[PDB]
Design a protein around this nucleic acid. Structure first.
Ligand SMILES: O=P(O)(O)O[C@H]1[C@H](OP(=O)(O)O)[C@@H](OP(=O)(O)O)[C@H](OP(=O)(O)O)[C@@H](OP(=O)(O)O)[C@H]1OP(=O)(O)O
Length: 48
RNA sequence: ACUCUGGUUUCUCUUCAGAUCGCAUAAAUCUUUCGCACUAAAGAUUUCCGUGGAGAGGAACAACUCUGAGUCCAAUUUUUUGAGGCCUUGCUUUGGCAAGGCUA
């Protein structure tokens, strides 16, 4: 849900101006952060 | 204005760290609370991601910038003079002292 949140955060700043709707936005650092912080927590679970 | 420290980088270990150890943020478990728990909150513990400090060990090139330490004044106002000489008493430790008056 959080990554979708960040998509809504990023796209609606990305798709302003002459940029319209479309699949061209990639500012991937926010979601990539979120999934790495998930990997931080489940690394010792899957390791155990 | 002459001389002796201390370096910096990197790899690793050990210990302390409730300090935004992290200008970022996970997960598990337990307990509590209400719902009726991914869509929910509290408290606590733990594990992870991965820090600062100190100590130690290796190995790479810099070695005295830095942090330190050991290492030109005679004219009013101070350090280039108002300084020296005479008289009375108390005692003379008979050398003279103390006070006052002087004279320059
Ligand atoms: O917000 P979501 O439910 O996750 O859906 C979004 C949304 O589509 P909808 O508006 O129809 O809901 C975006 O559109 P806008 O928010 O801009 O209006 C669209 O982005 P673009 O239209 O700008 O391309 C995006 O597509 P994507 O994330 O693939 O870029 C799409 O996500 P979905 O792929 O899940 O439909």
């Amino acid at each position: 849900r959080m990554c979708k949140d960040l998509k809504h955060l990023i796209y609606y700043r990305f798709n302003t101006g002459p940029v319209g709707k479309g699949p061209g936005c990639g500012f991937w650092a926010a979601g990539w952060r979120v999934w790495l912080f998930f990997m931080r927590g489940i690394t010792p679970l899957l390791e155990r």
